[PDB]
Design a protein around this ligand. Sequence first.
Ligand code: CYC
Length: 142
Amino acid sequence: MKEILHTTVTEVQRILQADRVLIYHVLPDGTGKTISESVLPDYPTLMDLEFPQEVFPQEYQQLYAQGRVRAIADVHDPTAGLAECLVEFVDQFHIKAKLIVPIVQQLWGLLIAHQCDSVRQWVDFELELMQQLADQISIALS
Ligand SMILES: *[C@@H](C)[C@H]1/C(=C/c2[nH]c(/C=C3N=C(/C=C4/NC(=O)C(CC)=C4C)C(C)=C\3CCC(=O)O)c(CCC(=O)O)c2C)NC(=O)[C@@H]1C
């Protein structure tokens, strides 16, 4: 399953030509953590870093359990909807755009793409494609 999640993020990174693709998993204590990552070598491996424990709030569990994709073209646009607690994070890791799709069975996790070199207008077919990839991960888990 660890090799399957690695294969998936690597293939999704190549398909989107994203700077990073990762899978973020919600743990039974209500914390969240990156568990698989493919990143272009000009950027850090987030999995190699020693992050403090991170609460994944009930607000976002209840949102993402509903299944909908969130495309954020420009994380610095004050109307684009980046969570306020992530403002310092996107600055420190030079994340400019992100694409988030929930992995649901009950939220298991999120498939997330980053653009780092530019803002990125994600287009409708890419949001549908990530929904299909999230469905493929859920089917694999079953
Ligand atoms: C604010 C709402 C709370 C919160 C929620 C949250 N976090 C993510 C996703 C990621 N968080 C990552 C890692 C860390 N590690 C830290 O120490 C830290 C604080 C500086 C963070 C943010 C991480 C690698 C991810 C996945 C990749 C990504 O870019 O998202 C999410 C889901 C994404 C989204 O934008 O909705 C949420 C809701 N984090 C907090 O610390 C608050 C308690």
